[PDB]
Amino acid sequence: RIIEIDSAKPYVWVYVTTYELLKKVKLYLDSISQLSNASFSNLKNKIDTILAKEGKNITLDSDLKSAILNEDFYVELEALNNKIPSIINAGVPLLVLEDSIGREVINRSLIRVRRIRIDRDKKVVETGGLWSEEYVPMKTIFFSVLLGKESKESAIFASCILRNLRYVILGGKETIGKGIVELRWVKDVI
Amino acid sequence: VLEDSIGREVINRSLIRVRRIRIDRDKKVVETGGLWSEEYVPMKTIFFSVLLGKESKESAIFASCILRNLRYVILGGKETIGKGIVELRWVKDVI
């Protein structure tokens, strides 16, 4: 969540990442670049040009210059090299924070929820049937890699199966309607 | 249909905050600490959700007999002060 001072461009939410998460993605990409024939020079150079701006909070798809994230944390941003095209495509700015701030922002971005359990014949809570529970919000982006070793079946897999994988169900609580998720392959989205 | 930076404030102020109390049965006055507020969502408010089901023979009978004859339910709390009655209109049935 954002309350953007110094912007007539009204954003209700915004994407937040930190430099440590970016360093981890860079390590993934560096490692699997050597261990395979593939290369991700576009993604790698995007990540590298962002990482070059370490020390200062920055925004990618806007020029906010200041904001109030998750109701508590003031930031003072900078513009990345005159609109460096950002990795994701959601018409919402991506902010890259110093990891100290980003830690608290990301903690405040999680969803904690009390649930209860009701006796099946007297509409009153059961004893012990009360607990909390944590979700990661919808619209959250995780970065993973799927690596395969040479084989016949590996080619059929990478060419027939991974081209019909879009929506899968991660996690648990799949009856509260949690865990629907969209896999978007870096090759055909970057 | 408002843009979000204003529709957010509008919809948030659009809820009913009723204050209830508890009464000293002998003084016939308000107990100390017996004052609180509750938020209600107005009548005729509309919520949208989906009911999904894996392949099964039970799923068939559920979606084809149960979900037909299910129109009214009671949601949430305060059922005895008349809150929480709800009608479910399926898009499938009548958009």
């Binding site: 309350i3 109701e71 003031y74 | 930076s5 957010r8 404030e9 102020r13 905050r17």
Partner: protein, 154 residues
């Protein structure tokens, strides 16, 4: 540097607390803080804000007292226990509006002391209404807690 809702509430409540000399003023201000937030929710910020301005019974020396409180910290709110309580909650709201940079101090003062500028202040508040109603109630909730912690009942 930027002060969040609770820190701004601390600073505002601290500047008010030293100005309410008589303790009845303090207790009436406690009663104010404890319900003007629910009022602001139910009736809207602008109606309740002008209600507070009226109930502060300005058009006296209370006005220059209230503007002096902004800077002197040696100033005293003068009036009856109802008038100064509303005057101090008005200072609370003005301090928020000024520190959050929503409305400048000069314009607020001149709108508060002039028949003319008051109407365009109404216009401006109807312009700036989302920017205020977004988060003023958290700061005012913190004010409520500070009041019912640092002051007692009648």
């Amino acid at each position: 540097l930027y002060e969040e809702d609770y820190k701004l509430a601390l600073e505002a409540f601290k500047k008010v607390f030293n100005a309410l000399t008589h303790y009845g003023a303090k207790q009436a201000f406690r009663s104010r803080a404890r319900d003007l937030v629910e009022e602001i929710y139910n009736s809207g910020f602008i109606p309740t804000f002008f209600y507070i301005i009226s109930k502060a019974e300005l058009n006296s020396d209370s006005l220059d007292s209230l503007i002096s409180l902004f800077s002197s910290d040696n100033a005293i709110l003068r009036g009856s226990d109802e008038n100064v309580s509303y005057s101090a909650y008005l200072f609370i709201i003005l301090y928020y509006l000024i520190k959050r940079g929503i409305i400048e101090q000069k314009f607020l003062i001149q709108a508060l002391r002039c028949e003319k500028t008051r109407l365009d202040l109404i216009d401006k508040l109807y312009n700036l209404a989302p920017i205020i109603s977004a988060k003023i109630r958290t700061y005012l909730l913190a004010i409520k807690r500070l009041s019912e912690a640092l002051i007692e009942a009648r």
